[PDB]
């Protein structure tokens, strides 16, 4: 029996009485962290009488905050209805991303360790409503989370009325596995220092608190979380992660790295899978991560050994890898600590213990500006998540990405990024499979030499070179040198013909 | 007697004989912050034998990395002397700026609150020479700095060799206002944690630690910070100030924020003046400042008690404040905190005590991302400062800004800016003279709708209303509408013809 506290059995109602609970207009608050433990049934049974009551002519949306990425049955049911009038803070899905870049869902991509603190502030308005997915309702009424911890909390916090679905699909052995927190981290001012000093240090409980009186509805449900597999590293993944191995190497010999480097945050993506993968077999040993999640790649690292333990707030696995940990939750229980995103993303924290950040990129420009999530400035791919939390934070900010996209049809190196989401000073190394490119001690044209010999791919190298030494000659000042006429050309050269390289 | 431990007293010289312990291709750290408490007479020196080498075709440049903004006698005379070849993270001479604008001196503006941790790690070199500015050298050897803490202790730690300037114009009363940590902030990882959890809180110790074996020279001098020109509020600025002064009066009266408001952090100028002199007018009590400078406009509220303490690294005062500040030391020494920069300036404790943040800027685009550097995209100003620190850390994030700049000439908002320093989630609520856009909650579309609504110009209103309605029909993407091929062209019809404003010998859309 999952729900231990025999008091609360008795809110026990149908996914469909639940979504009755939801008004248009409302502002949801949910669980869900890169396709981990986001509510799955009570969205469908919402996403149904949404579209009836459009077809009524009744108006019917819901703002939806979340921890960060949820999966088919939330962000996806929830598009297809047309039932999200805005968004945050991060979103994967394909339904919802065509919503948002066809202007019917509004978005916004806070910094993901920001998002509580905006809640609590009340920059998203008054939380309607908390819709928590739990493994278990232990026998005092604590909720234990599934695979991901993410906001739940402040959610629980700041919402008038409490939704819980209890999943059976969800491990019962993830009971233990989080750390949440007591004290202040997103609260008003002034808040709390927060104790961690190491990255495997458990500062809290391991329960959701939640007054019971707030409880309108408790689920039982029954569906899987559902993620993509990562692409097999590639010829491209595996040249980068080559030359990061390299660079690390050099750092340690020189002194500059301990020979377990410091605590891993690997972003989202193929190539910061890939780069983990490479690790898991590497010189380095003992290693720590301080993550905003667990990757594949990251688990892999785990069960070599090469990695002793691993901090984050979510997971986010394959249907493959999700299988492989549920078999053998005893083993990577110890070796897991899911925290509260405000404390896994919080810029003190990641400062303190030395994180190096390894992040994926869309496109740099010449001058190692980075864009993590507009393509052509304009249309959105996922969004920021925590790669600002990260990459300003760190002691070293790494961006890692194939030099071309689209099959060589875009340069992911550029005249100009159409969207920066990280400017110069929070990028210090650039990697692509043509090589990579160390900015530190470097000004803006430094840093251009540099990215346009190592980074940029043959077939645009050329070119890139050509607008710099043409910027040099003629642009306004020469500090950061540009020809304001062609910057974003290439961009616009795809818009027209759906390539970057001249005809 | 201001050098009081007798043994460093034998290791005073002449400023001349102590330049020529610099040597070409030296990196240098020195003290200076908001133009205030940096070396004057041996950067003088150094200068001259700068230019009398170049003279005879003998090189002679150093690296010059500081806390933030000198003078005139180091950023001014090094640069005239074409004596820097790489420069670091701030600056604010306009000699300087030319060097860096024409490519004579390479420039990157960090982070002021990072400075210190990446010399630490060594992305600047090794540091050859600190030359450092005090009012006193203890008995016991410690280093007491003067009108600015910055970077000096983390410059001290690093240098092989130490140069010493004491400056007998500074108060000797300065002695105590400091507050200086021993603790690791920006050193090797696990950092500690800094317990700092109230703006006048003290951690540390008057003065600046140095192993006396380090000590190569001292030098004894008499001359003025740069106290520049005080820059009274105009029309433009006392609306600004007017506007938020009110947006903090609904916060207040929605219990968003309490009657003491948060710890306040102002750029310095015009609209900050204007500002603080609202708040010494305003129905505020028991404010607190944790900033990077202390300006004019705090002595008065710390007089009269509207003011409870101001913590920064620096002084940035006119030489009427300047002036008042050393005659009454003895009560502003106790109202007043100057700490290292990378404390001012820690993401950690701005976050932590809710700051308020409120900077200026170059130019927002329409959908509210922040340029702070780089007019046009390629020429350097000043440098990204503190601003990223203060406004991504902050509890409310704020930029004020006149609407249009040059004489109208030019938009402070554009279709997209030429340059990024802050990005939307770090700014919440644009200010102009045109009126207050809060953002929060707000999708980059929406956005757009309050930032040309309330903050743009007239003048300029319809043209952007019109680049943002034809984006929206036309941008690949409608998350936040581009249109390519014109998004920086306002910018460059400035560069070709000295204005933003369009021709109506031509065909605009706006104009239809
Ligand atoms: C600690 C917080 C970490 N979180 C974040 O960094 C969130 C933001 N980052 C991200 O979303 C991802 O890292 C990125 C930026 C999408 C890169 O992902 P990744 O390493 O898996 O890259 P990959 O090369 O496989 O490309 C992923 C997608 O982006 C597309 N893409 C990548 N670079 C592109 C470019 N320069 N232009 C256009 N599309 C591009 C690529 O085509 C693919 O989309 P489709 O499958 O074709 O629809
Ligand atoms: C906590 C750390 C705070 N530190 C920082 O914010 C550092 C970065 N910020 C800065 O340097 C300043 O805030 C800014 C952005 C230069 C604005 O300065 P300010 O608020 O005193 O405004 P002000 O209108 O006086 O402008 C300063 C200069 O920039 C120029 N300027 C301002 N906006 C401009 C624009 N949109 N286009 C071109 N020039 C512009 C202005 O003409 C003036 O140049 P001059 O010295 O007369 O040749
Ligand atoms: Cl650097
Ligand atoms: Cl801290
Ligand atoms: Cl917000």
Same mark, same amino acid.
């Given at each position: 029996?999952?729900?231990?506290?025999?008091?609360?059995?008795?809110?026990?109602?149908?996914?469909?009485?639940?979504?009755?609970?939801?008004?248009?207009?409302?502002?949801?608050?949910?669980?869900?962290?890169?396709?981990?433990?986001?509510?799955?049934?009570?969205?469908?049974?919402?996403?149904?009488?949404?579209?009836?009551?459009?077809?009524?002519?009744?108006?019917?949306?819901?703002?939806?905050?979340?921890?960060?990425?949820?999966?088919?049955?939330?962000?996806?049911?929830?598009?297809?209805?047309?039932?999200?009038?805005?968004?945050?803070?991060?979103?994967?899905?394909?339904?919802?991303?065509?919503?948002?870049?066809?202007?019917?869902?509004?978005?916004?991509?806070?910094?993901?360790?920001?998002?509580?603190?905006?809640?609590?502030?009340?920059?998203?308005?008054?939380?309607?409503?908390?819709?928590?997915?739990?493994?278990?309702?232990?026998?005092?009424?604590?909720?234990?989370?599934?695979?991901?911890?993410?906001?739940?909390?402040?959610?629980?916090?700041?919402?008038?009325?409490?939704?819980?679905?209890?999943?059976?699909?969800?491990?019962?052995?993830?009971?233990?596995?989080?750390?949440?927190?007591?004290?202040?981290?997103?609260?008003?001012?002034?808040?709390?220092?927060?104790?961690?000093?190491?990255?495997?240090?458990?500062?809290?409980?391991?329960?959701?608190?939640?007054?019971?009186?707030?409880?309108?509805?408790?689920?039982?449900?029954?569906?899987?979380?559902?993620?993509?597999?990562?692409?097999?590293?590639?010829?491209?993944?595996?040249?980068?992660?080559?030359?990061?191995?390299?660079?690390?190497? !050099?750092?340690?010999?020189?002194?500059?790295?301990?020979?377990?480097?410091?605590?891993?945050?690997?972003?989202?993506?193929?190539?910061?899978?890939?780069?983990?993968?490479?690790?898991?077999?590497?010189?380095?040993?003992?290693?720590?991560?301080?993550?905003?999640?667990?990757?594949?790649?990251?688990?892999?690292?785990?069960?070599?050994?090469?990695?002793?333990?691993?901090?984050?707030?979510?997971?986010?696995?394959?249907?493959?890898?999700?299988?492989?940990?549920?078999?053998?939750?005893?083993?990577?229980?110890?070796?897991?600590?899911?925290?509260?995103?405000?404390?896994?993303?919080?810029?003190?924290?990641?400062?303190?213990?030395?994180?190096?950040?390894?992040?994926?990129?869309?496109?740099?420009?010449?001058?190692?500006?980075?864009?993590?999530?507009?393509?052509?400035?304009?249309?959105?791919?996922?969004?920021?998540?925590?790669?600002?939390?990260?990459?300003?934070?760190?002691?070293?900010?790494?961006?890692?990405?194939?030099?071309?996209?689209?099959?060589?049809?875009?340069?992911?190196?550029?005249?100009?990024?159409? !969207?920066?989401?990280?400017?110069?000073?929070?990028?210090?190394?650039?990697?692509?499979?043509?090589?990579?490119?160390?900015?530190?001690?470097?000004?803006?044209?430094?840093?251009?030499?540099?990215?346009?010999?190592?980074?940029?791919?043959?077939?645009?190298?050329?070119?890139?070179?050509?607008?710099?030494?043409?910027?040099?000659?003629?642009?306004?000042?020469?500090?950061?040198?540009?020809?304001?006429?062609?910057?974003?050309?290439?961009?616009?050269?795809?818009?027209?013909?759906?390539?970057?390289?001249?005809?």
């Amino acid at each position: 029996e999952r729900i231990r506290n025999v008091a609360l059995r008795s809110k026990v109602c149908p996914a469909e009485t639940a979504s009755e609970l939801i008004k248009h207009g409302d502002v949801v608050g949910t669980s869900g962290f890169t396709g981990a433990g986001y509510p799955k049934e009570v969205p469908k049974a919402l996403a149904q009488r949404m579209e009836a009551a459009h077809d009524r002519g009744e108006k019917y949306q819901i703002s939806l905050i979340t921890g960060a990425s949820t999966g088919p049955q939330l962000d996806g049911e929830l598009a297809k209805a047309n039932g999200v009038y805005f968004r945050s803070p991060f979103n994967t899905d394909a339904t919802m991303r065509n919503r948002i870049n066809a202007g019917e869902t509004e978005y916004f991509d806070n910094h993901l360790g920001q998002v509580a603190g905006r809640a609590v502030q009340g920059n998203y308005g008054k939380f309607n409503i908390a819709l928590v997915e739990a493994t278990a309702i232990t026998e005092d009424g604590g909720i234990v989370p599934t695979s991901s911890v993410g906001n739940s909390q402040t959610f629980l916090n700041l919402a008038e009325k409490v939704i819980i679905e209890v999943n059976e699909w969800q491990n019962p052995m993830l009971e233990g596995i989080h750390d949440i927190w007591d004290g202040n981290v997103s609260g008003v001012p002034t808040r709390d220092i927060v104790p961690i000093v190491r990255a495997d240090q458990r500062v809290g409980g391991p329960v959701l608190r939640v007054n019971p009186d707030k409880i309108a509805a408790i689920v039982r449900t029954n569906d899987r979380d559902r993620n993509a597999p990562f692409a097999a590293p590639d010829e491209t993944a595996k040249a980068i992660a080559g030359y990061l191995l390299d660079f690390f190497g !050099h750092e340690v010999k020189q002194n500059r790295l301990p020979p377990s480097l410091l605590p891993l945050q690997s972003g989202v993506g193929n190539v910061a899978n890939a780069v983990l993968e490479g690790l898991k077999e590497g010189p380095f040993e003992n290693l720590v991560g301080y993550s905003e999640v667990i990757q594949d790649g990251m688990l892999a690292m785990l069960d070599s050994g090469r990695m002793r333990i691993a901090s984050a707030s979510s997971f986010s696995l394959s249907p493959e890898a999700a299988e492989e940990i549920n078999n053998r939750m005893d083993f990577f229980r110890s070796k897991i600590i899911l925290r509260q995103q405000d404390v896994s993303n919080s810029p003190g924290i990641i400062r303190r213990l030395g994180c190096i950040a390894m992040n994926g990129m869309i496109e740099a420009d010449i001058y190692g500006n980075v864009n993590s999530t507009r393509v052509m400035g304009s249309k959105m791919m996922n969004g920021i998540g925590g790669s600002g939390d990260f990459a300003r934070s760190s002691y070293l900010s790494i961006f890692l990405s194939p030099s071309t996209a689209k099959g060589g049809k875009i340069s992911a190196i550029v005249p100009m990024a159409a !969207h920066v989401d990280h400017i110069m000073q929070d990028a210090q190394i650039f990697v692509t499979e043509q090589g990579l490119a160390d900015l530190r001690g470097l000004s803006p044209v430094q840093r251009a030499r540099e990215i346009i010999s190592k980074c940029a791919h043959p077939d645009y190298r050329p070119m890139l070179q050509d607008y710099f030494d043409r910027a040099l000659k003629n642009s306004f000042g020469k500090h950061t040198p540009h020809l304001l006429t062609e910057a974003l050309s290439w961009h616009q050269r795809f818009i027209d013909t759906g390539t970057m390289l001249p005809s």
